[PDB]
Amino acid sequence: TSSELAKKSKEVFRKEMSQFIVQCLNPYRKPDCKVGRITTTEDFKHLARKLTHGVMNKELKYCKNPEDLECNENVKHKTKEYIKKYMQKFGAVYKPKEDT
Numbered sequence: 001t002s003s004e005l006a007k008k009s010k011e012v013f014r015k016e017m018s019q020f021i022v023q024c025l026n027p028y029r030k031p032d033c034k035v036g037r038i039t040t041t042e043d044f045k046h047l048a049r050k051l052t053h054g055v056m057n058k059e060l061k062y063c064k065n066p067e068d069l070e071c072n073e074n075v076k077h078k079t080k081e082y083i084k085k086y087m088q089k090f091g092a093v094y095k096p097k098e099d100t
Contacts, residue, residue: 006066010056016071017079018052024083025051028094036087038094047094051086055079 002009025048029038038044055078060069071079089100 002065002067006069009066009069013069013071013075014052014056017055017075018048020071020076021048021051021055021079021083024080028087035092036090036094037092043094043096047096050096051079051083055082 022044025038025044027033028036029041029044031037038047055075056069059075059078060066063069086100087094090098
């Protein structure tokens with residue numbers, strides 16, 4: 001049932017994860033963020049979207065069956081760790097035009 005299960009699971013996942021990523025990015029949008037400080041809300045939102053999309057794509061590659069495409073613990077783990085490591089490339093400020 002995973003073709004349709006996943007229709008709903010990807011949107012739910014991407015939503016959960018966008019919220020989780022949003023939560024994760026929250027300290028970065030703060031004016032005293034040392035690393036990967038998010039410039040603007042639009043950038044914050046764009047990045048949250050983008051990160052959701054990259055976690056999603058990478059696991060869709062290494063999972064292939066979206067019955068497991070969930071913003072689960074494993075995924076969260078991978079995500080927030082990915083996020084940190086990701087934002088470390090921006091430097092002080094988040095500069096997506098100089099992103100990977």
